[PDB]
Amino acid sequence: MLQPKRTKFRKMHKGRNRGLAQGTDVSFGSFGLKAVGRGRLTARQIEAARRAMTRAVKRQGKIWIRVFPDKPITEKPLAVRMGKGKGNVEYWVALIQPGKVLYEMDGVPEELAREAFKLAAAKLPIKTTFVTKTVM
Amino acid sequence: MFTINAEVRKEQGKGASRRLRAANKFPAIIYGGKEAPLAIELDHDKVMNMQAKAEFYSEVLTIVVDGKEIKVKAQDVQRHPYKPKLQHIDFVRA
Amino acid sequence: AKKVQAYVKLQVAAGMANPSPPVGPALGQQGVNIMEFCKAFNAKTDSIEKGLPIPVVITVYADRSFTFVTKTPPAAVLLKKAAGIKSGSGKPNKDKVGKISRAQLQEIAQTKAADMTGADIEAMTRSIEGTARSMGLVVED
Amino acid sequence: MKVRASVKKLCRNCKIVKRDGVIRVICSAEPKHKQRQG
Amino acid sequence: SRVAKAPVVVPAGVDVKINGQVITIKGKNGELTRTLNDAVEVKHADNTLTFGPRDGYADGWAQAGTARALLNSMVIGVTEGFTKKLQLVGVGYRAAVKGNVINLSLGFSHPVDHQLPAGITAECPTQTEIVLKGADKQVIGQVAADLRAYRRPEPYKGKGVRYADEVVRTKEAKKK
RNA sequence: GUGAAGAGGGAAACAACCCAGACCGCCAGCUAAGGUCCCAAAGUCAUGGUUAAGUGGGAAACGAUGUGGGAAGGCCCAGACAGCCAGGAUGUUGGCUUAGAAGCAGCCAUCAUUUAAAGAAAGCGUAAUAGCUCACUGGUCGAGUCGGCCUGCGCGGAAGAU
RNA sequence: GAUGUCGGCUCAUCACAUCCUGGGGCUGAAGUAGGUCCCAAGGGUAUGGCUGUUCGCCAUUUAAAGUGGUACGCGAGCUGG
């Protein structure tokens, strides 16, 4: 998994929130993936996605990162009676909402960007969809 | 440049707004200067394909409302947050 | 496979027309004869320059006969000579390893002229210029 | 045949034939590109 | 569209019956058809056995473009034979001919055989070849398949009863 | 909020869900939730459309000229789209690597000419060339056509124990 | 206000994600046996040494000695390790 480099608390509520995010559209790159689904990324998924993306666009592209896991959440091992104490941080989730931008490519063809994002998400569970900045 | 067909909208509130969009008619306003704002409803399908092109956001549009013409520019554009579908577009006069 | 037409084109230097394998079993099969072709070839190569494979066009016939026109040494080889570094150009257009003047290109175009296509001598000169640019040998004259 | 659940593309001579409710591949260049389903 | 709007033809020396949805030709050198269609509209002219899209369908014009070529292919099914060779790689496979039996084997202890249907004529002088020359493009094509389907060309050798094409590559044998 | 402490009607039956709170009787009438092909009371109702999997009547990642509707774009009688006639030339079987890799192991060139069109090339083949075929392009043909987009309904994916 | 735990024995029965036989696809498929994957439950699916082990390890066979459910099947049938 992937985790913060600085913290202030070491456990966090699972958190239930409604849809929509402020970052709805790209504001740097000319391409992106926004979200259609919602859920939580374990953070091995974010790791796999980054990997797959890079291998395609090569060093031609230009990268911007959004979505940061920062909610830890604990997991109690098997053979432990639930609701007696609380487990150890074995999650590092990023609560995601519809329209949440993932990554952002630029400096590449539209086709190349699509088939780096196609490789990325497919190791991210939610359905995604292509973004073209246009001029806005 | 797109020369686009719209008409006055006298139907307001979220309920009516939602209802409107299903009939391919999405709310919108023209405003500019100290002239009165014109609450119109453009046609979804038409504007959808037009706004896909960058021409829309960067050239004088001419929205024919009630046999008159108003020269505007498309300023802000409030899209659906995971579909290329629209929900509203703010127009600031040119 | 090893099927081949009777109008072959091949490059061989002297003493590499003597074996059948680097010309391929392919055209060895035909009415062109390895032995015959070798000694005939190697005679005429003495007068001309050599250093890299030399393009000869053999026209085979079905009576076990053949005729061949041995062309003048390649445009590439001639350009290498002009540039003063020969035995290939390594990997072209990733380094510079020659210089070629407008004068050199014109000379080479006139010598190769017979075997070339081109509207004018000018057309042919540009063809040789494209070979220089393809060998990574710059033209800055 | 060999179960592969995504047709993709493997050759230009992959015809991509829909026979029954499945979409198999018959390929006459290489029999390796055949698959049962899609 | 295309085929389904191209004009049907009944060639000279061929004749047709009045049918509701059956395709039946008569005469000679074209006198056997028995195929059914189930969304044609069997209308007539004097040289066009016409087909259209039957009521209760909206894809009945598929059946019409079918019926067109299907008629025309059994005019020349009878007139012209098919499977005029059917060769084979591999020795000991051979054939024999009795003018209505044609033997085949792959080196089998007992030869396998096809007793050719009525109206289907076959013989051959070459005994690694099977020459059919009977009636109906379909009929012939079925019997043709039964031959070659015992052993087919391989993608490292090509051994196996062929027809008129092979799929083979020069894959490297292992255990060498 | 209900059950607890509430029956009745509906959810196949199923305390907790949905409808509606039973003073009592009457082989009375009108409705609710929910239903109207038969078992089993009432529409094989009217109007229009969609769907062929028995979908409806368990499933997702994901895959697919499935099929219906809408808008836009590319191409089209100055000839598109399929097929068919061809062109497939030349400097140049270019260079590194290798005796020989000289379009097509890997690496580099991937320019220019001939032109209506013709890549120093997509694969088969050869260590690799040679050859075969090909995205590339002209003629013939004779009328519509090619992919995305929004969107409805289907399809595959879909294996278990009396 | 009692539903006898596990294992074996004995007797089974069902499911298929199939170990074997039957039918195939692909193969780097030389033949030869195979490898891999698909269809298939009709039938068939080893004896001993040690250990209560279910299981495992080992020995030697066989076409193969499948896997799981059935109160980790079967004590108002047996044993009581």
From Swiss-Prot, chain A:
Q: Might you report a single GO cellular component term?
A: cytosolic large ribosomal subunit
**Sites of the modification (3R)-3-hydroxyarginine?**
R81
| InterPro entries, A to Z | Ribosomal_uL16, Ribosomal_uL16_bact-type, Ribosomal_uL16_CS, Ribosomal_uL16_dom, Ribosomal_uL16_sf
Judging by the UniProt lineage, the source's domain of life is Bacteria
What modifications follow translation?
Is hydroxylated on Arg-81 by RoxA. The modification is nearly suppressed when E.coli is grown in anoxia.
Alphabetized, the UniProt keywords read: Hydroxylation, Methylation, Ribonucleoprotein, Ribosomal protein, RNA-binding, rRNA-binding, tRNA-binding
The alphabetized list of GO BP terms reads: cytoplasmic translation; ribosomal large subunit assembly
Q: Which GO terms describe its molecular function?
A: rRNA binding; structural constituent of ribosome; tRNA binding
Which Pfam families does this entry report, sorted A to Z? Ribosomal_L16
Q: Which family does it belong to?
A: Belongs to the universal ribosomal protein uL16 family.
NCBIfam families according to UniProt:
rplP_bact
Name the job this protein performs. Binds directly to 23S ribosomal RNA and is located at the A site of the peptidyltransferase center. It contacts the A and P site tRNAs. One of the last ribosomal proteins to be assembled in the 50S subunit. The simultaneous presence of uL16 and bL36 probably triggers ObgE's GTPase activity and eventual dissociation from the mature 50S ribosmal subunit. It has an essential role in subunit assembly.
Subunit structure comment from the entry: Part of the 50S ribosomal subunit. Cross-links to the A and P site tRNAs. Interacts with assembly factor DarP(YjgA).
Supply the name of the protein: Large ribosomal subunit protein uL16
Q: Which gene encodes it?
A: rplP
UniProtKB/Swiss-Prot annotation, chain B:
Q: Which GO terms describe its biological process?
A: cytoplasmic translation; negative regulation of translation; response to radiation; ribosomal large subunit assembly; translation
Q: Name one GO molecular function term.
A: structural constituent of ribosome
Q: Which SUPFAM superfamilies match?
A: Ribosomal protein L25-like
Q: What does this protein do?
A: This is one of the proteins that binds to the 5S RNA in the ribosome where it forms part of the central protuberance. Binds to the 5S rRNA independently of L5 and L18. Not required for binding of the 5S rRNA/L5/L18 subcomplex to 23S rRNA.
* HAMAP family membership: Ribosomal_bL25 (MF_01336)
Question: Subunit details for this protein?
Answer: Part of the 50S ribosomal subunit; part of the 5S rRNA/L5/L18/L25 subcomplex. Contacts the 5S rRNA.
Would you tell me the protein name for this molecule?
Large ribosomal subunit protein bL25
UniProtKB/Swiss-Prot annotation, chain C:
Give the lineage: Bacteria, Pseudomonadati, Pseudomonadota, Gammaproteobacteria, Enterobacterales
Instruction: Describe the subunit structure.
Output: Part of the ribosomal stalk of the 50S ribosomal subunit. Interacts with L10 and the large rRNA to form the base of the stalk. L10 forms an elongated spine to which 2 L12 dimers bind in a sequential fashion forming a pentameric L10(L12)2(L12)2 complex.
Family the entry assigns: Belongs to the universal ribosomal protein uL11 family.
PTM annotation (N6,N6,N6-trimethyllysine): residues? K3, K39
List all membrane-crossing ranges. Answer: none
Q: Which residues carry this modification: N6-succinyllysine?
A: K71, K80
Keyword flag RNA-binding: yes
NCBIfam families given in the database record = L11_bact
Residues modified to N,N,N-trimethylalanine? A1
Alphabetized InterPro entries for the sequence = Ribosomal_uL11, Ribosomal_uL11_bac-typ, Ribosomal_uL11_C, Ribosomal_uL11_C_sf, Ribosomal_uL11_CS, Ribosomal_uL11_N, Ribosomal_uL11_N_sf
Which terms are listed as keywords in the entry? Answer: Methylation, Ribonucleoprotein, Ribosomal protein, RNA-binding, rRNA-binding
As recorded in Swiss-Prot or TrEMBL, the protein's gene is named rplK
Q: What does this protein do?
A: Forms part of the ribosomal stalk which helps the ribosome interact with GTP-bound translation factors.
Q: What is this protein called?
A: Large ribosomal subunit protein uL11
* UniProt-listed Pfam families: Ribosomal_L11 (PF00298), Ribosomal_L11_N (PF03946)
Any one Gene Ontology cellular component term annotated for this protein: cytoplasm
From Swiss-Prot, chain E:
The yes or no answer to whether the keyword rRNA-binding is present is yes
Similarity-based family: Belongs to the universal ribosomal protein uL6 family.
Listed GO MF terms: large ribosomal subunit rRNA binding; structural constituent of ribosome
Which keywords has UniProt assigned to this entry? Acetylation, Antibiotic resistance, Ribonucleoprotein, Ribosomal protein, RNA-binding, rRNA-binding
- GO CC terms in record: cytoplasm; cytosol; cytosolic large ribosomal subunit
Protein name (database record): Large ribosomal subunit protein uL6
Membrane-crossing residue ranges in chain numbering: none
Assembly description: Part of the 50S ribosomal subunit.
Q: Which residues, renumbered to this chain, carry the PTM N6-acetyllysine? A: K43
Organism annotation = Escherichia coli (strain K12)
Q: Which gene encodes it?
A: rplF
Report the protein's function.
This protein binds directly to at least 2 domains of the 23S ribosomal RNA, thus is important in its secondary structure. It is located near the subunit interface in the base of the L7/L12 stalk, and near the tRNA binding site of the peptidyltransferase center. Gentamicin-resistant mutations in this protein affect translation fidelity.
| PANTHER family attached to this UniProt entry | 60S/50S RIBOSOMAL PROTEIN L6/L9, LARGE RIBOSOMAL SUBUNIT PROTEIN UL6M
Q: What is a biological process (GO) this protein takes part in?
A: ribosomal large subunit assembly
User: Pfam families attached here?
Assistant: Ribosomal_L6
